């Protein structure tokens, strides 16, 4: 819509990266609270791309996670950072 | 040391919750950058309590994750929030 997608680190097909950005755009259009945004994104990837995804949405965080190959993306959408990854 | 541990949500034995707080205290004493803090905590729980843990450290984030029973803690230590959980 108005928000700039900047992908920072991805281990993920470009189709799926575009999905991630799409999902997060829909989440940001629907929700204002970071946990709700993360939930929307997580639930839709669990549906679309199989469980089990995990999503963190915020302006200030660092992380260290373990993900399945080809199932990791860390990106900005506007001023919010989104970590989305599959493990389990 | 000086930082106040405030546990917000836990699905975890009280022994392990104390370990989590201990680990994060050591991390904060050693590291200033959130990703490094998260890495220290993640790696030590992977060692002490078996893989696979995931750790997020920050002042602003929401999350939605899936964890194994009895292997979840979300807490503050000082002004930083720490999410630490096992999945995989």
């Amino acid at each position: 819509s108005d928000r700039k997608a900047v992908i920072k680190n991805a281990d993920m097909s470009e189709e799926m990266q575009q999905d991630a950005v799409d999902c997060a755009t829909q989440a940001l259009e629907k929700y204002n609270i970071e946990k709700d945004i993360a939930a929307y994104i997580k639930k839709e990837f669990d549906k679309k791309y199989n469980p089990t995804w995990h999503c963190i949405v915020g302006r200030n965080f660092g992380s260290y996670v373990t993900h399945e190959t080809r199932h990791f993306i860390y990106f900005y959408l506007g001023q919010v950072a989104i970590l989305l990854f599959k493990e389990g | 040391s000086d930082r106040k541990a405030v546990i917000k949500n836990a699905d975890m034995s009280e022994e392990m919750q104390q370990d989590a707080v201990d680990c994060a205290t050591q991390a904060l004493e050693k590291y200033n950058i959130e990703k490094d803090i998260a890495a220290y905590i993640k790696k030590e729980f992977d060692k002490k309590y078996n893989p696979t843990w995931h750790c997020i450290v920050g002042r602003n984030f929401g999350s939605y994750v899936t964890h194994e029973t009895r292997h979840f803690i979300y807490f503050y230590l000082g002004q930083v929030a720490i999410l630490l959980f096992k999945e995989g």
Partner: peptide, 10 residues
Amino acid sequence: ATSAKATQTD
């Protein structure tokens, strides 16, 4: 099958 990743906000 897996990798570990670190992320840090700007």
